[PDB]
Amino acid sequence: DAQRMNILAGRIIAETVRSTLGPKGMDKMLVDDLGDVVVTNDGVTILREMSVEHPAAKMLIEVAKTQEKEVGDGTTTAVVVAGELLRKAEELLDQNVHPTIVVKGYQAAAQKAQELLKTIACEVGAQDKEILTKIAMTSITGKGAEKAKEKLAEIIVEAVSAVVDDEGKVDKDLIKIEKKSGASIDDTELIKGVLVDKERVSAQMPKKVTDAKIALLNCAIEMLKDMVAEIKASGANVLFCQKGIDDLAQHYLAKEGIVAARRVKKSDMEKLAKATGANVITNIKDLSAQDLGDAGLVEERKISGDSMIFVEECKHPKAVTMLIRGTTEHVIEEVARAVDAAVGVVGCTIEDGRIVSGGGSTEVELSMKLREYAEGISGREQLAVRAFADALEVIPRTLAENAGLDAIEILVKVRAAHASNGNKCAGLNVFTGAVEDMCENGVVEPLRVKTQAIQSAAESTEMLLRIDDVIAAEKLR
Amino acid sequence: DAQRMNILAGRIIAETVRSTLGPKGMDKMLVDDLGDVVVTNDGVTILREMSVEHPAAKMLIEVAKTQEKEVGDGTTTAVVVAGELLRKAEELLDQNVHPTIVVKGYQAAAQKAQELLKTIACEVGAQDKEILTKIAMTSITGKGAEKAKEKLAEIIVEAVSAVVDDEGKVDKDLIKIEKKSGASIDDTELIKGVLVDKERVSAQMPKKVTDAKIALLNCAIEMLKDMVAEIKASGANVLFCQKGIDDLAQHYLAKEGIVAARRVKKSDMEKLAKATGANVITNIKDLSAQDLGDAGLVEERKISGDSMIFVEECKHPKAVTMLIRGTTEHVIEEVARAVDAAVGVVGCTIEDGRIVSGGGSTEVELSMKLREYAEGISGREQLAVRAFADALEVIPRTLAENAGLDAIEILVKVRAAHASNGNKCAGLNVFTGAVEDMCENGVVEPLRVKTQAIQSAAESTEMLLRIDDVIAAEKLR
Amino acid sequence: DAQRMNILAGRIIAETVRSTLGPKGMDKMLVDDLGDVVVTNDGVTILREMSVEHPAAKMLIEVAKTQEKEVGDGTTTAVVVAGELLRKAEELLDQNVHPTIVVKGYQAAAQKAQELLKTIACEVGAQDKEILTKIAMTSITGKGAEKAKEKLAEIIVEAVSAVVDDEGKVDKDLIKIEKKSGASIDDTELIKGVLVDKERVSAQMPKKVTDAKIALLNCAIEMLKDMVAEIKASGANVLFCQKGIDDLAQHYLAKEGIVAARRVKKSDMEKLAKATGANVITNIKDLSAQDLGDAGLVEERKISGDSMIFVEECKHPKAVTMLIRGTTEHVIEEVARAVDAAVGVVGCTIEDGRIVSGGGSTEVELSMKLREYAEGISGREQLAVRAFADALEVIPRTLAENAGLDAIEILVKVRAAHASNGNKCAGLNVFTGAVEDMCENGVVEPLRVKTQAIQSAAESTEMLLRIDDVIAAEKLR
Amino acid sequence: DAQRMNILAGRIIAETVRSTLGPKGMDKMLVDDLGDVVVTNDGVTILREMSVEHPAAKMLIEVAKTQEKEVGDGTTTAVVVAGELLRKAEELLDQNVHPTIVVKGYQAAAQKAQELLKTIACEVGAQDKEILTKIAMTSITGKGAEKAKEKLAEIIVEAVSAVVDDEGKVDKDLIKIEKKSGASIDDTELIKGVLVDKERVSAQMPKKVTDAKIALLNCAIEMLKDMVAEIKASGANVLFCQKGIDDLAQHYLAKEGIVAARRVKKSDMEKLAKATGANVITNIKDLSAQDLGDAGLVEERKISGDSMIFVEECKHPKAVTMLIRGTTEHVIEEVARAVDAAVGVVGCTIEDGRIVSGGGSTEVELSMKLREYAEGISGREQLAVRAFADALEVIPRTLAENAGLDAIEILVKVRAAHASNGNKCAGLNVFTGAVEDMCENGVVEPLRVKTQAIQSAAESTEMLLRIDDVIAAEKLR
Ligand SMILES: Nc1ncnc2c1ncn2[C@@H]1O[C@H](COP(=O)(O)OP(=O)(O)O)[C@@H](O)[C@H]1O
Ligand SMILES: Nc1ncnc2c1ncn2[C@@H]1O[C@H](COP(=O)(O)OP(=O)(O)O)[C@@H](O)[C@H]1O
Ligand SMILES: Nc1ncnc2c1ncn2[C@@H]1O[C@H](COP(=O)(O)OP(=O)(O)O)[C@@H](O)[C@H]1O
Ligand SMILES: Nc1ncnc2c1ncn2[C@@H]1O[C@H](COP(=O)(O)OP(=O)(O)O)[C@@H](O)[C@H]1O
Ligand SMILES: [Mg+2]
Ligand SMILES: [Mg+2]
Ligand SMILES: [Mg+2]
Ligand SMILES: [Mg+2]
């Protein structure tokens, strides 16, 4: 009774982002209380912006937060599978199956799914840039752009492959994301170093400094003669002032051949302190030759529509930065979420070396094998394993729904292609309407995406099914 | 629309006799317009006594008439499977599957069922009286009596085995059914020959005649001296007059040592003409010594409550007669329908030599194998093949329902016993509640029972699905 | 207003037989006031059996009566197109198009359809038995039997080809249809001559007569010696008496070696007078040696279930008779309607020598060409020509509907195959689900089928659109 | 469901300005919350003044803002086509066509429309003043004045042709728009230079100065003797003070033969700095002989109702200014929007050299060619391309509706005139009621008008169709 409304609340959250799955997915319209409009195909964006107050709905959201924290992609996939599991479980409750039996079936079916996924996955090499590019292609194109990814995917593959340490681990904090308005999306490029979105405050100043000694000054300049003497004595050639710089000081800086920029953002003072290794000085007497950062090259090179300072050839950091360019602000914010997703799947591929074919092909193969495993189960426990397998068909059907095809006959032909030692990679290519080999089409995604999503969907539904009543408590906590 | 109510009418006829399946089946109460009450477990009895006016209902009844004409048992099974097919097909219509696709699926699944049944069936020898007894045991005990069949089954096995010609064919008209009230049911016995429920019209007449010359007279006797001269000249010792015999003629018949009975029924004049080989004479001049029948013994022996004429030791006919004894009239009529059913299954076993294990095991094994065949089908045609396999589960579930068990978990454990090269004969034994090997329990039925019923259920449902509207015609015919 | 209900009444008659189109057509159930049931796929049977009282409905039925009288097939096609024309016309009335403009458009579009059909049709030779077999195959298989036609079609092709006179005309009365119950449908055969469903009244009579002299006697026999003298003097060896024959006359007829049959039907006296060329004598003195018919062989040969007199090897008549065999009465009556249809289309093919590809391919090709012709029309008259073209798509759509496919995308792919100098014979093969060349599949039908159906559909709808009110008259006639 | 109301909101915005299309367009009445009344035929004026709160309505308005920013004309055409696309798409949704299929059809049909437009357009010479006059005639006369354009169009053609640089590009900021109340509309004239709506502060001052040295003074005058010495030493003859001028300074300025005006607007200080090339001095010591601007003539000539300073014969700027005259304020504001529109179409003509015939002729020709392209499409994707072609007919129909004619037969005769390679420029001349060659009537518009409008209408509808639900978000942004 009161238990069912929890199942209802969970399915409501699922069907909210249901139609946003896959490249041909539908866009949702987000409207706040102030009348601002947001249109997006990304599932996790919709999940965080929703006005979610129901507890069972929040218990489901923690799957997407967990799925994105541990993988970065598949949050839409995990939520939809959880919703379909709740629907199939409600059907079994309507057949007088006790909830604990459904949980025992789901729990046993989730473990068997993990073992089967470990055998379906194909092994790849952490140096195969082609397979890594196909992984990024599949992960980004689910949002809604074609062939522009081919340039961005190779940029992301080169960025991640550079920050891979000698242990095969990928630290996403080593790849800084930088967002700036520009002329077009294609202007997005990768830079071996760090970026400063400023220009020389005086054109007479020298524009390039090699073997730079970076100085981070947090005090305004606008007494002053002794300040210039102390800074010049520290043996520095590059100065970054967070506040302003005196116009008379900008002259003596240009005469001494010293590049300097004022109005430097607080974020640039933080990244220079973290990367190059400088302190944020609070008193000019503290500035020394050791607080300076080291950099092989500091060059301000213009770009399409803007001029900014590039700090390249820094051997000490071993890190890179993504310069994201775009026309509008919402386009840039959409491109940023595409990079965060591709970084996750490429990172998971290098760490795990296990991938499966996408397009719902792996789901169908897993569904068929689980129905075989269900046959051998005695006791009511079997019916839950059946539903768990038939629940996985929600992923290929939703893809066919959003592709405009008849999900019934599409799901039929794919099941036929997998039947009796078929092609475990046969799926629906939403661009052609035919059933093809997803591996030959370059549609692949990491194994951790599927394993983490399925386990996350199972554990949440198991948690909801153990709830049979909600009780009005007082105070607590 | 108007099509669906036809499907509804069929399921109504199905669910009417649904709970009458199996030995533990439920009894139905038949009440006419005059207030007479009839309680029975036999399905075909209920089907003919129903006030059936709907055309789709009549189209369903013709399956039971065909099933009983071609087999004699399994009419309940064919009707129930037809109803479950109608229910599963209605589900597919509710999923926007066109009727012709369902027909194509059912039609292709019915043919695959015939091929699979031909491989599940076990071969037996036409002389194995033990297996023939187990066949009769299974067919009769479905009505509602225990271990009394063991005596009757061996009587039926000996009766059928005697009339088997040199071509393995069984003519049910060679086994005459005779019903007479008596002391108990156990008094039912088999007689090697034919019976005449008459007595000597004169006690002074000789009661026994050996090497009898049977005479069939169709003319009343009550000129007359020339009639006695012609009949005595024909060289006959036994006379059967359909009409009466003169009292003065009854005297000269008793004096000459000639046994004679008057008021002989028309059925006895037919069976004597068919068995012993005599003509029905219409003019006394046609009576000759060749129109006489031959019989080794003609003896009138009294029985409990009656005296009648037995004609035994007739090597020429090669036919026998069943003497049915019972307490009441309704009990005898129930025993007669048990014999007509057992005669059919024993006859089908000797002619075909193919039997299958009961208990729903053949249905479950066929259902499981058909779900495997459905996997390889592309196009919407697959979904009908799925439903056709899952429709067969109505037979084991109804047995479990009528046995008082939980049909869900019973059907689960049986499917587990058949899964992955299991025991094709594993079913639910309604007397113990456990799943056992039906072959080891002696629960077997002929192959023609299953093949004819399944094909009959498919063809009727196929015929109903091609109907999409009923039109108000005028006159016609 | 009152005009529209006429359009409604016509569409009701159309959609009544709509789903009966094509081989995969649906079956309708006809129920009279007495409860008798008739299930059929044939459209014209349903049209005559309907309880039709509405005048506009009767005005539509006369199209099927006209289509069947002048062609024999396509009555369902003409009715459905007429109904679709009425629907498209109702749309134009709802756009404030005057009925006479719709008529002017329909009338101008119907004539242009005749011009295009004359150029789409392919020419065949009146001696090409292969193409004639494909014509009969296509026309019969629309009812619901497979490959049994291949034997029956060649029988029908040989029957029609024999009665073709030296002017290419086919008289359907020269091919007698004979219906008799038998063992199976395959026993249907063609006989080179005429048939008499009688047997020799005396088995002692000689059973065979060669070089027969047929005599037609209309006077009862049962004076008599002078009658035998006059008949024997006329020089006849075969006598057909419509009334009875004296038993003593049956003796003297059998002694003279003269075959004779009594109780001969009136239909047999008519066909013998028409074929062999004999007179129906009304006075024994009129019987002469010249009133006799000539026949090479008269033989009474038994068949499965009956014995009858065959009159073969008659060179003079030039006519044949179809012996229809079947299991039940309704099956035979269904086979008879198939022959009458095939005779019509084969006759239309030999007379015209023009055929078009079936399957709806010709309809789509005609529809596409009419939309091109519609473009060049000025004034509101154009809109009707558009509707006339888009109305023809009802035939391929109904075939796709009855085949279980999605009529939308099937109709799309066919239009694509015909577009920009495509294949004018590309249609939907309901047996495979793919679009194929209908000529290569052997699916063809005579040009007169299409031309007469389209003109019949147009003229009736033209007649309905000129009706704008119904007036309550008195007496009249 | 919730998606459909978005389609509804867009069509509401479309039909709001629907009847304002073409010269015979209808006037709309705008009433604010204060009771002020505005009557206009201009579509873009109505679109910005509407109380638009619905998001889907705003998403549609952004098309008119985009169309006006990139072209300047066709905003009404793009909105109406967008609305008609939404209506035709709703019909396809009511036929169970998935939105992504409609988008795929629209997207593919929009690209084919761009390619077809590139071949329909005729090339013109950037020096052909006659064709440029016909372009301005067609663009302005859509608002509501006759033959007054012939004088204004030639004025606009001369203004744009003067500011065309050596690269064929037209910078609209080089043509300054000046609005002033006057005696009549015909007093609108073009001035080769820049305008200053000021008069001499002293009538005793000389009114004309040749070889002027423009001085821009930003400091108030009202020490003062040294200020006059520094300005006179700089060698200047014309002074523009943004603030006031001392009355005693106004005396010494009049004695030296120096023209001076005080209270000069900030816009005049900006335009003089941009055109003549002068600096805005902030300290009298910075004024030099090089900060002065150069001008061949500075003359204050009175006009009907006012006197102002004209700065003509300035070879250096290469820019001109439009003096707009009118009776009332609202009349002047309407004339200004006419010039901005004509400047856009004349500019697009010189840059592109591609024009198409107006009157809906290009729309009909594009509609007919797209229906030919639609024929060859397989799969449901075709149906959207059909609707896209039939959607373009909204433009000729709306013109015929506003012209008072029967849109049905007018659209018919135009389609007939275009059918099978008709006159691709045949359209409806709303002044005569007949179908004529629009090129021979001087009804032409640039290619960029159609290409940008069609693409803008398609992309917006594509964006609306990807929306399937609106979600209640919290906070965001
Ligand atoms: N080219 C493609 N063909 C078929 N399926 C695809 C393709 N690209 C992506 N997908 C599917 O889209 C799904 C993910 O899409 P999306 O919802 O955008 O991201 P998320 O992984 O967060 O759910 C994956 O399961 C994948 O199978
Ligand atoms: N001892 C038993 N255990 C399990 N099933 C049985 C047993 N005896 C009979 N059956 C089942 O009963 C079914 C037939 O029973 P019943 O309805 O009485 O006759 P009918 O064949 O006319 O329907 C068979 O399909 C068989 O599988
Ligand atoms: N093998 C076939 N494949 C496709 N269409 C067929 C085939 N055979 C017959 N048809 C179609 O069936 C239609 C006629 O069927 P039916 O309604 O039974 O007879 P009628 O010609 O009286 O309407 C024809 O228009 C023909 O195109
Ligand atoms: N003289 C004319 N004859 C026929 N049509 C015209 C004429 N002048 C303009 N039009 C039509 O009017 C349409 C534009 O009118 P309007 O709505 O006033 O401006 P906008 O271009 O902003 O929509 C063009 O599509 C053009 O075809
Ligand atoms: Mg993704
Ligand atoms: Mg039974
Ligand atoms: Mg036909
Ligand atoms: Mg305009």
Distances (CA, A) of C352 to C64, C359, C424, D186: 21, 21, 20, 78
Q: Beta D320-324 vs A435-437: how paired, if at all?
A: unpaired
User: How many of the other CB atoms lie within 10 Å of CB of C403?
Assistant: 23
Q: Supply the DSSP symbol for A50.
A: B
Distances (CA, A) of B463 to B84, B86, B107, C405, D447: 15, 11, 11, 20, 63
Ligand nearest to the CA of D79: 4
Q: Give yes or no for a contact between B218 and B281, defined as CB atoms under 8 angstroms apart.
A: yes
Distances (CA, A) of D266 to A291, D20, D249, D277, D290: 50, 38, 21, 16, 22
Interface contact B476, partner C, CB < 8 A: yes
User: How many of the other CB atoms lie within 10 Å of CB of B181?
Assistant: 15
Cβ-Cβ contacts under 8 Å, C24 against chain B:
100
Q: How far apart are CA A399 and CA A359, in angstroms?
A: 8
A20 CA → ligand 1 middle, Å: 9
Tokens, residue C186: 């395959």
Ligand 2 atom with minimal separation from the B427 CA: 4
D378 and C416 within 8 Å at the Cβ level: the answer is yes
User: How many of the other CB atoms lie within 10 Å of CB of C144?
Assistant: 16
Nearest CA to C64 among C330, C338, C341?
C341
Deposited experimental method = X-ray
DSSP D193-237: EEEE----S-TTS-SEEEEEEEEEE-S----HHHHHHHHHHTT-S
Q: How far apart are CA D392 and CA D409, in angstroms?
A: 17
Q: Beta C306-312 vs C444-446: how paired, if at all?
A: unpaired
Cβ-Cβ contacts under 8 Å, D95 against chain C:
408
User: How many of the other CB atoms lie within 10 Å of CB of C394?
Assistant: 26
State the nearest Cα–Cα gap between B110 and chain A, in angstroms.
20
Q: How far apart are CA C321 and CA C189, in angstroms?
A: 9
How many CB pairs (< 8 A) connect A and D? Answer: 82
Interface contact C146, partner B, CB < 8 A: no
Interface contact C403, partner B, CB < 8 A: yes
- Residue listed under structure tokens 């000639």: B258
Please list, in sequence order, all residues whose beta carbon lies within 8 angstroms of the beta carbon of residue C476, skipping any fewer than 6 positions away.
none
CA dihedral C419, C423, C429, C433 (to 10 degrees): -50
Tokens, residue A463: 């948690």
Q: Give yes or no for a contact between D99 and D468, defined as CB atoms under 8 angstroms apart.
A: yes
Neighbour order of strands in the sheet with C354-357: C122-123, C354-357, C444-446
Residue to probe by mutation, ligand 1, list A443, A452, A454, most atoms within 8 Å of CB: A443
Q: Both ends of chain D: CA-CA distance in Å?
A: 27
Residue to probe by mutation, ligand 2, list B17, B21, B41, B364, most atoms within 8 Å of CB: B21
Ligand 1 binding pocket includes A67 (Cβ within 6 Å)? no
Q: Supply the DSSP symbol for D472.
A: E
Residue to probe by mutation, ligand 3, list C138, C140, C393, C405, most atoms within 8 Å of CB: C138
CA–centroid distance for B278 within its chain: 29
Residue nearest to atom 4 of ligand 3 (CA): C359
Ligand nearest to the CA of A398: 1
Q: Give yes or no for a contact between B189 and B332, defined as CB atoms under 8 angstroms apart.
A: no
H or E element, residue A293:
strand A293-303
Interface contact A415, partner B, CB < 8 A: yes
Ligand 3 binding pocket includes C77 (Cβ within 6 Å)? yes
What are C259's strand-pairing partners?
C238
Q: Residue B165 in 3-state DSSP?
A: coil
Q: How far apart are CA D217 and CA A174, in angstroms?
A: 56
Ligand nearest to the CA of B425: 2
B375 and A368 within 8 Å at the Cβ level: the answer is yes
H or E element, residue A153:
helix A148-163
- Residue listed under structure tokens 């129920």: C31
Q: Give the residues after which the backbone of chain C is interrupted, taking a C-to-next-N distance over 2.5 angstroms as a break.
A: 222
Helices (H), A235-327: 247-255, 266-272
Please list, in sequence order, all residues whose beta carbon lies within 8 angstroms of the beta carbon of residue D273, skipping any fewer than 6 positions away.
D216, D279, D280
- Closest CB from C368, C376, C413 relative to D416: C376
Ligand nearest to the CA of B366: 2
B466 and C49 within 8 Å at the Cβ level: the answer is no
Based on C-alpha coordinates, what's the Rg of chain B?
A: 27
What are C294's strand-pairing partners?
C213
Q: Give yes or no for a contact between D109 and D385, defined as CB atoms under 8 angstroms apart.
A: yes
Interface contact A416, partner B, CB < 8 A: yes
Nearest CA to A172 among A345, A356, A354?
A345
Among B92, B369, B408, B410, which would you mutate to test the A interface (most chain A Cβ atoms within 10 Å of its Cβ)?
B408
B433: left (phi over 0), alpha (psi -120 to 50) or beta: left
Q: Residue B30 in 3-state DSSP?
A: strand
Which of A146-181 are b and which e, b meaning 16 or more Cβ less than 10 Å from the residue's Cβ?
A: eeebeebbbbbbebbeebbeeeeebeeebbbebbbe
Ligand 3 binding pocket includes C425 (Cβ within 6 Å)? no
Distances (CA, A) of B29 to A388, B54, D441: 44, 21, 94
Ligand 4 atom with minimal separation from the D42 CA: 18
Amino acid sitting at position C106: Y
D140 CA → ligand 4 middle, Å: 8
Ligand nearest to the CA of C357: 3
Nearest CA to D347 among D157, D178, D206?
D157
Residue nearest to atom 22 of ligand 4 (CA): D74
Ligand 1 atom with minimal separation from the A427 CA: 4
Q: How far apart are CA D124 and CA D356, in angstroms?
A: 10
C379 and D413 within 8 Å at the Cβ level: the answer is yes
Distances (CA, A) of D48 to D53, D61, D68: 12, 8, 12
DSSP C14-46: HHHSGGG-STTPPEEEEE-TT--EEEE--HHHH
Tokens, residue B25: 């089946």
Q: How far apart are CA D197 and CA D208, in angstroms?
A: 16
C378 and D95 within 8 Å at the Cβ level: the answer is no
Ligand 2 binding pocket includes B396 (Cβ within 6 Å)? no
Ligand 1 binding pocket includes A402 (Cβ within 6 Å)? no
Residue nearest to atom 20 of ligand 4 (CA): D74
State the nearest Cα–Cα gap between A420 and chain D, in angstroms.
31
Q: Name the packing angle between helices B447-465 and B99-120 (round to 10°).
A: 180
Helices (H), B121-147: 129-140
Based on C-alpha coordinates, what's the Rg of chain D?
A: 27
Tokens, residue A395: 């992923």
Ligand 4 binding pocket includes D75 (Cβ within 6 Å)? yes
Q: How far apart are CA D437 and CA D424, in angstroms?
A: 8
Ligand 2 binding pocket includes B344 (Cβ within 6 Å)? no
Interface contact D378, partner C, CB < 8 A: yes
Q: How far apart are CA B144 and CA B146, in angstroms?
A: 7
Q: Beta C122-123 vs C354-357: how paired, if at all?
A: antiparallel
Amino acid sitting at position C460: S
- Closest CB from A24, A50, A404 relative to D473: A50
Instruction: List the domain boundaries for chain B.
Output: 1-124+354-477, 125-191+318-353, 192-317
Number of H helices, E strands in chain C: 16, 16
- Closest CB from D372, D375, D409 relative to C416: D375
Ligand 1 binding pocket includes A134 (Cβ within 6 Å)? no
Q: Give yes or no for a contact between D142 and D22, defined as CB atoms under 8 angstroms apart.
A: yes
Q: Give yes or no for a contact between A13 and A79, defined as CB atoms under 8 angstroms apart.
A: yes
Q: How far apart are CA A435 and CA A361, in angstroms?
A: 10
DSSP A163-193: H--TTS---GGGEEEEEEE-S-GGG-EEESE
Q: Give yes or no for a contact between A52 and A64, defined as CB atoms under 8 angstroms apart.
A: no
Q: Give yes or no for a contact between A184 and A326, defined as CB atoms under 8 angstroms apart.
A: yes
Interface contact A35, partner D, CB < 8 A: yes
Q: Give yes or no for a contact between B381 and B5, defined as CB atoms under 8 angstroms apart.
A: no
H or E element, residue A110:
helix A99-120
Shortest CA distance from B368: residue in chain A = A375
| Strand intervals (E) in B385-432 | 426-428
Tokens, residue B304: 């409990």
- Residue listed under structure tokens 């015209």: C352
B473 and C30 within 8 Å at the Cβ level: the answer is yes
Interface contact A363, partner D, CB < 8 A: no
Ligand 4 binding pocket includes D182 (Cβ within 6 Å)? no
